[PDB]
Design a protein around this ligand. Structure first.
Ligand SMILES: *[C@@H]1O[C@H](CO)[C@@H](O[C@@H]2O[C@H](CO)[C@@H](O[C@@H]3O[C@H](CO)[C@@H](O)[C@H](O)[C@@H]3O)[C@H](O)[C@H]2NC(C)=O)[C@H](O)[C@H]1NC(C)=O
Ligand SMILES: *[C@@H]1O[C@H](CO)[C@@H](O[C@@H]2O[C@H](CO)[C@@H](O)[C@H](O)[C@H]2NC(C)=O)[C@H](O)[C@H]1NC(C)=O
Ligand SMILES: *[C@@H]1O[C@H](CO)[C@@H](O[C@@H]2O[C@H](CO)[C@@H](O)[C@H](O)[C@H]2NC(C)=O)[C@H](O)[C@H]1NC(C)=O
Ligand SMILES: *[C@@H]1O[C@H](CO)[C@@H](O[C@@H]2O[C@H](CO)[C@@H](O)[C@H](O)[C@H]2NC(C)=O)[C@H](O)[C@H]1NC(C)=O
Ligand SMILES: *[C@@H]1O[C@H](CO)[C@@H](O[C@@H]2O[C@H](CO)[C@@H](O)[C@H](O)[C@H]2NC(C)=O)[C@H](O)[C@H]1NC(C)=O
Ligand SMILES: *[C@@H]1O[C@H](CO)[C@@H](O[C@@H]2O[C@H](CO)[C@@H](O)[C@H](O)[C@H]2NC(C)=O)[C@H](O)[C@H]1NC(C)=O
Ligand SMILES: *[C@@H]1O[C@H](CO)[C@@H](O[C@@H]2O[C@H](CO)[C@@H](O)[C@H](O)[C@H]2NC(C)=O)[C@H](O)[C@H]1NC(C)=O
Ligand SMILES: *[C@@H]1O[C@H](CO)[C@@H](O[C@@H]2O[C@H](CO)[C@@H](O)[C@H](O)[C@H]2NC(C)=O)[C@H](O)[C@H]1NC(C)=O
Ligand SMILES: *[C@@H]1O[C@H](CO)[C@@H](O[C@@H]2O[C@H](CO)[C@@H](O)[C@H](O)[C@H]2NC(C)=O)[C@H](O)[C@H]1NC(C)=O
Ligand SMILES: *[C@@H]1O[C@H](CO)[C@@H](O[C@@H]2O[C@H](CO)[C@@H](O)[C@H](O)[C@H]2NC(C)=O)[C@H](O)[C@H]1NC(C)=O
Ligand SMILES: *[C@@H]1O[C@H](CO)[C@@H](O[C@@H]2O[C@H](CO)[C@@H](O)[C@H](O)[C@H]2NC(C)=O)[C@H](O)[C@H]1NC(C)=O
Ligand SMILES: *[C@@H]1O[C@H](CO)[C@@H](O[C@@H]2O[C@H](CO)[C@@H](O)[C@H](O)[C@H]2NC(C)=O)[C@H](O)[C@H]1NC(C)=O
Ligand SMILES: *[C@@H]1O[C@H](CO)[C@@H](O[C@@H]2O[C@H](CO)[C@@H](O)[C@H](O)[C@H]2NC(C)=O)[C@H](O)[C@H]1NC(C)=O
Ligand SMILES: *[C@@H]1O[C@H](CO)[C@@H](O)[C@H](O)[C@H]1NC(C)=O
Ligand SMILES: *[C@@H]1O[C@H](CO)[C@@H](O)[C@H](O)[C@H]1NC(C)=O
Ligand SMILES: *[C@@H]1O[C@H](CO)[C@@H](O)[C@H](O)[C@H]1NC(C)=O
Ligand SMILES: *[C@@H]1O[C@H](CO)[C@@H](O)[C@H](O)[C@H]1NC(C)=O
Ligand SMILES: *[C@@H]1O[C@H](CO)[C@@H](O)[C@H](O)[C@H]1NC(C)=O
Ligand SMILES: *[C@@H]1O[C@H](CO)[C@@H](O)[C@H](O)[C@H]1NC(C)=O
Lengths: 169, 342, 341, 170, 341, 168
């Protein structure tokens, strides 16, 4: 979003990222490898799922006929009753539209926050020998092709796999 | 090497609105609405649903029952939910009524607005002590009773002056007592008979127009009868008659009396309706087929899937989806991204 | 060493709903609702609150005052807020009325819906020029005035034909003029007396049922009197009477005249009510005890703490909490966390 | 929340953190020291207080009786008036429920943002010799015990007290 | 050197409310409201707007047209939007009516509530077969027709008993048939003439009060005539008359008949109104000058700029701004910051 | 906001920052240079503009008169119709106020997020020889006066122009 646009995050996307919405790319001699992060994708899906349940919880009163107002005899009253139903429908609809708007607003905007969190996951795995650029990228001393990138996405990557120093857990 | 964070790129045909980015394409959505299709009406799940007032009263319309037509008495189940299937209820028997000269047609629709509906066991007025000289109660071939003898609407008494009483009278007043149980509304049915000049004198000893006045809850209604030249019998038993009756109802709130000022041809109230509670009413049609989460005036019976619906808003009762102006979607994916220049 | 950011861990019995995380436990909440308890009704804080129409008219019901019962005349204070304490107002004196034959009972309830209520000082009709021959005005032992002489409802005049005028009449029409001031509604009280056949002939020279018709703002009402065989006297002075009166009211919007068509036994309108403004009305009970931020039809007087309340929704006026379906909490702490390993 | 979960922030919590909601822990030979940050806790409390006032500012019209509609005479109108009151109550209630929901959503979600801010406070105090891991933790060249951690929470910690370099302050 | 991120500092007089920081000053706002000013009313853009019922009926009030005053017949254009410019409509010619004795004044306001309004071409009742002996139709100098001959309200027939039929009658009943087309409401106009004792006997052979009763859609109304001593002529032709008429209307829903019970002096319905659809109605004034996005009962015609407005809420139709309690602003800048030291 | 307050971000502001809402300051021997970031300001302005369009999209039904209810004759019904209009106005108004509040809440709150994004823009340009403090500031090995700062704001700044290393 606006964060990524200002921060210089890549505005494009990766067609090869098919197993998830969010993840990592690797650029080196191998060309460009792409891996989806399932943890980030699941978290996003769960948030949306909870949001769906929340929107589905709304209860409003039924609109039925007046028991006392008779057709023809009370048509003036019945016209007002019609107006009451119509305005209720109008008002609650716009309230629901507002609730859904804010939900989608939250969902779309949260994208860059996933990227910022994925940065933190990446950084710790890469170890203190990696250099943080700021645009969502890190420079590594080692090569990282698709086999490497997959271990990163899975959270199994260790910097010791190139005899590089690690942050101890 | 350089390792970066990234977002997917996929087919994004779906559109949602945002506050700060306008409309955006997304890879996936969860639809929150459907447009229902019209279906038959049905029983409301978890609630016995009233259609006809007396379901087991065959060949009897709701208005027949409400007027207390002979052979049209029966069990009237209580119901918290009711279907209005007759916007202008009709009769299908008994003595010919000039319906549209009063509000009487809507009487059964008024009744179905109550949860509990029952006919009184006692008469609200004693014909043998009613003002206006001595009377006999009249019967007719158009109203055969339960032992197939000549009768009349059980809600009323067609009183005809005795041979020593065939004379015109000043308008006399009767007070209609509240005889229903605690919290019940009393709905009192009454009216007046009229005929051509010859029959009027034979029956009543007066062939001038007769006048009738009711008063209840601050509401006064005034009628003047017609002597001959009637519209033809309709919605009746089919037996030719020279006379017509006019019928009205009078609502009496708990502990409230009503009055009727009358002359010749009066149909004194007898059995009255006692009603309590409220039934939830919507327009619909019969028969009720099957069961549904929700009854909807436009779509009939429908079950609830999506939390919202689009289409024709109308009165609806039960477990219903909430109406919205537009087919709302919940975003379930990411904002569209063009493929990155690799 | 390793220094990290962290969040506390404490007992988290309180639950709130979120959009994206469902229901969550928290260390603390700020409650936004209460369930009020039923209390006595009270004066609305900062606003004069009407109970009885006429506070200084002791041993007088609101309907007594509205009909202008003798000894029941007095100041009727203006009020922007009023309590409806009688769903079906009763009289407690004067001549026996057959109340339920008209809408007359609701008259004081109609009046209290106005901010300002006053009785006119002049009569709306002169009995000495009123249609239907010359009259004398009748009075009754049932209606003792302030010096205990025989009187009658000050809103009406019981006109009785003079001894030379005891004769039946065709229904005659009188126009009831609008005599109130700019913007005021006029509420015209009127009716008719009836009796048994003997007294009817003595009083009026006619023992047939009499007929009465009123028209105002498109509303017409028609009445036919009853000769004898009356229901028992109720809500009256207790002095036995053979006759009964029927009383009705007639609303006249600003500058609007009404008509009354009448025969024998007519109670011509005299003093009329002039009313303006709107009073905010809810159901309640008397007496009004103390002061409150808010008057609530179910809970009576209540003071405002929480911005919201749960329980029985009903009409309410003043500085009131807003009704909600559920006991809402505002999160005031952190989402529950198990103790760190 | 989701950020911390993805970023590898500690999902557990510290019972010893009683003076506040948010703060710091230190891990070394001393074991584990815990100090609450009062500024971060106060900031959260002020936001919640402002949110409470905002919700309390809502005013809606009183529902009272119609002045003209009389009992018995106008019962049909009065039934409609009851329906109007009921629907008003229903609609405003759900609107308030939405407002409170969004408020609580904000409050719960802001937790990880507090942690991210506490990182910046910590980082500046620790000086250029400390190493940022990314999961909300820093590796120091020096020891930092409860007496030390308390100085961090108080914003008084200096890196020169361990002969380590500082960011010169502006 | 030290390079930092920073935020500007400027004059920040504008204030907005936030959820978590209370009120804050900002460098700029986008105002979301205006307070409209009262203007003349206008045509609603994209919608033909009804003022007078009959534009081509010159020197005719809406009530004149609705009653079928001679010289006041013409095309009544359909309109989805109508302006109620007379809360209490008046006549300006023809025979003297006692208006306030019925609901008749509101008849044209009732009509304008429909989209389509037309007068029937045939009479709803044949005067020559109507109950109550043989009749001739009366006319008046007060109602000159288009060739200045004596006429009468085209919606009614002033029926007068023939010279061999000058006699009192008991109330006779006539059915008013539904003669309108599919889906149309029928609005039936009718009434009764009265006069002093002398003219009553000359015209009708009876100088007693006459009685009239109508019934339609469960609504019954009852009237009793007045013999002489009438209120003074108003809103009529100006030609002196000894008699007065009372006029009423009767709404007949589709396929529904009504009845009129009457005696002498009856004004039988002739041409009836046929009406269908709904017109959107608000209070306003004439003439409609120009075009506007929105018609507002307080501000008249107004065009839409800001999405919301502050001020007097009232009924409004068209492309209108939405009313709000306060002048809302959208923040378009940054929260106030003191100049950096 | 609360983030900056805890993070130690500068709470004051720069009067010299006139070309934009957000940007950079440089502190050295030159004194204090100030440059606005146009990209960050535009992004903020566009968000607010979209937010304006969203608020302007709300449509509610007209309130007009009942066609059937006549003055005087139906005043009781008309009083209720008046009440219905008043409550509609009241309810929608309060809904709109909530919508505007959340909008303003977003706009004000996003300020610190702009500063955090400007950090990433700054950091990449400054190269690996610069030191990140955490309070939104960076310590550079080279001097950066106004001519330099303008190049940072414009995104043209290169570290090789001071013979310092760049992210390649
Ligand atoms: C069903 O209708 C029949 C009438 O068709 C009812 O039976 C009849 O009731 C009348 C009135 O009680 C009987 O007339 C009476 O006759 C005796 C002498 O027989 C006389 O003293 C009375 O004054 C009165 O005139 C009539 O005989 C009787 N039976 C028949 C065949 O008409 C029957 O009661 C009704 N049943 C129900 C359940 O309503
Ligand atoms: C964003 O979604 C819109 C709406 O689905 C897409 O526009 C449609 O594209 C299809 C092509 O398959 C056309 O047949 C439709 O006529 C278009 N409709 C509209 C309203 O434009 C649009 O292509 C999508 N954009 C992207 C980048 O996927
Ligand atoms: C709504 O759901 C009910 C079930 O809850 C449906 O009723 C079922 O209908 C099927 C045949 O269509 C029967 O085999 C089941 O025994 C019925 N179940 C019950 C509980 O009655 C009903 O048809 C559905 N209606 C609609 C309109 O979808
Ligand atoms: C939202 O979309 C996601 C996918 O983007 C859905 O999750 C997948 O559902 C399919 C079933 O159709 C499973 O096979 C996958 O394993 C799910 N997870 C993925 C693809 O990561 C999810 O069901 C959607 N949400 C809702 C409420 O339907
Ligand atoms: C979260 O809050 C809920 C609600 O207070 C807790 O559930 C209750 O736990 C108590 C034990 O003290 C039981 O007596 C109640 O019956 C429980 N109620 C419900 C609805 O579950 C729950 O224990 C809390 N969870 C944590 C981790 O503190
Ligand atoms: C209250 O008491 C009596 C009502 O009967 C009034 O006094 C009457 O005045 C007339 C004057 O015409 C005299 O005949 C008597 O003094 C009284 N009448 C009778 C029949 O005895 C008195 O004016 C009334 N009103 C007050 C005191 O304000
Ligand atoms: C609501 O308002 C005030 C609260 O201060 C109460 O009025 C006071 O109540 C005390 C205790 O009964 C008495 O001294 C007086 O009735 C009032 N005192 C003063 C100085 O005015 C009132 O009773 C409260 N009512 C409720 C229901 O809480
Ligand atoms: C929200 O909760 C916080 C703490 O959970 C409350 O602040 C503390 O509570 C009282 C103040 O009355 C004192 O014991 C503490 O010193 C407060 N400050 C802390 C713990 O930092 C706060 O009062 C609550 N908010 C509301 C509106 O009640
Ligand atoms: C924030 O805005 C408020 C409102 O415009 C400013 O308060 C006004 O200041 C002017 C001049 O100093 C006074 O004439 C007004 O009377 C003040 N208004 C009120 C309601 O008190 C305030 O000065 C602004 N603050 C800053 C820092 O610019
Ligand atoms: C207007 O004026 C008179 C009504 O007084 C109508 O004149 C009648 O016309 C018919 C046919 O031409 C003659 O048979 C009558 O003898 C005329 N009556 C009188 C009194 O002259 C005239 O036709 C009317 N014009 C209209 C209604 O268009
Ligand atoms: C209207 O003016 C008339 C004359 O055009 C006035 O004459 C009244 O007529 C009645 C007839 O019964 C008599 O009492 C008097 O001749 C007048 N009465 C009064 C009270 O003045 C009359 O004044 C005016 N007002 C009306 C008729 O209401
Ligand atoms: C509302 O806007 C319309 C324009 O759409 C205004 O009407 C124009 O007025 C100017 C001024 O002379 C004329 O030149 C145009 O020809 C008019 N156009 C139309 C279509 O009428 C109208 O005056 C505005 N009204 C208000 C109240 O602002
Ligand atoms: C919000 O405020 C900004 C300024 O803070 C407005 O931007 C100005 O618009 C002009 C043209 O209208 C452009 O030259 C620049 O973008 C700004 N000018 C200056 C001198 O800074 C912006 O137009 C405002 N937004 C809205 C919707 O009105
Ligand atoms: C990546 O490198 C590792 C180790 O050299 C090994 O899996 C293989 O050489 C490469 N795999 C791919 C898919 O490029
Ligand atoms: C009934 O038939 C008669 C003639 O036989 C006719 O006058 C009348 O209009 C008819 N009415 C109906 C309702 O059919
Ligand atoms: C009516 O009054 C008489 C006289 O006191 C009394 O005997 C009778 O019981 C009363 N009846 C009722 C129903 O009140
Ligand atoms: C840290 O605690 C140690 C004991 O564990 C002790 O030296 C002292 O209290 C603290 N450090 C210093 C330098 O004082
Ligand atoms: C008609 O208008 C003329 C002038 O336009 C005016 O003299 C007259 O009084 C109006 N009314 C009648 C009935 O002529
Ligand atoms: C800033 O940097 C260079 C140094 O040569 C030059 O362009 C400029 O004059 C310097 N001074 C100022 C005030 O910009």
């Amino acid at each position: 979003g606006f964060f990524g646009a200002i921060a210089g995050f890549l505005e494009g996307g990766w067609e090869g990222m098919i197993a998830g919405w969010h993840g990592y790319t690797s650029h080196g001699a191998h060309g460009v490898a792409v891996a989806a992060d399932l943890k980030s994708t699941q978290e996003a899906i769960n948030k949306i799922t909870k949001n769906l349940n929340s929107l589905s919880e709304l209860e409003v009163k039924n609109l039925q006929r007046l028991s006392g107002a008779m057709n023809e005899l009370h048509d003036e009253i019945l016209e007002l009753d019609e107006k009451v139903d119509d305005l209720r429908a109008d008002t609650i609809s716009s309230q629901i539209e507002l609730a859904v708007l804010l939900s989608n607003e939250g969902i779309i905007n949260s994208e860059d926050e996933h990227l910022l969190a994925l940065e933190r996951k990446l950084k710790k795995m890469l170890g203190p020998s990696a250099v943080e650029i700021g645009n969502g990228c890190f420079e590594t001393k080692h090569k990282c092709n698709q086999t490497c990138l997959d271990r990163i996405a899975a959270g199994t990557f260790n910097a010791g796999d190139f005899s590089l120093p690690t942050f101890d857990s | 090497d350089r390792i970066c964070t990234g977002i997917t790129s996929s087919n994004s045909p779906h559109v949602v609105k945002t506050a700060t980015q306008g409309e955006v394409n997304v890879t996936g959505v969860i639809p929150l609405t459907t447009t229902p299709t019209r279906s038959h009406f049905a029983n409301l799940k978890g609630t016995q649903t009233r259609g006809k007032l007396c379901p087991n009263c065959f060949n009897c319309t709701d208005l027949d029952v409400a007027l207390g037509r002979p052979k049209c008495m029966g069990n009237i189940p209580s119901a918290k939910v009711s279907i209005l299937h007759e916007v202008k209820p009709v009769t299908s028997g008994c003595y010919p009524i000039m319906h549209d000269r009063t509000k009487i047609r809507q009487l059964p629709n008024l009744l179905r607005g109550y949860e509990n509906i029952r006919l009184s066991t006692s008469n609200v007025i004693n014909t043998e002590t009613a003002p206006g000289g001595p009377y006999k109660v009249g019967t007719s071939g158009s109203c055969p009773n339960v032992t197939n003898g000549n009768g009349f609407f059980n809600t009323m008494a067609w009183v005809i002056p005795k041979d020593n009483n065939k004379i015109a009278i000043n308008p006399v007043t009767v007070e209609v007592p509240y005889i229903c149980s605690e919290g019940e509304d009393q709905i009192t049915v009454w009216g007046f008979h009229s005929d051509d000049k010859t029959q009027m004198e034979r029956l009543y000893g007066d062939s001038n127009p007769q006048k009738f006045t009711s008063s209840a809850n601050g509401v006064t209604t005034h009628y003047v009868s017609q002597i001959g030249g009637f519209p033809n019998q309709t919605e009746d038993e089919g037996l030719k008659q020279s006379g017509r009756i006019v019928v009205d109802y009078m609502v009496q709130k708990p502990g409230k009396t009503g009055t009727i000022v009358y002359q010749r041809g009066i149909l004194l109230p007898q059995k009255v309706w006692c009603a309590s509670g409220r039934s939830k009413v919507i327009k619909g049609s019969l028969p009720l087929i099957g069961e549904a989460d929700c009854l909807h005036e436009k779509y009939g019976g429908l079950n609830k899937s999506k939390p919202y619906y689009t289409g024709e808003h109308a009165k609806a009762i039960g477990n219903c989806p909430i109406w919205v102006k537009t087919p709302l979607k919940l975003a379930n994916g990411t904002k569209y991204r063009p493929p990155a220049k690799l």
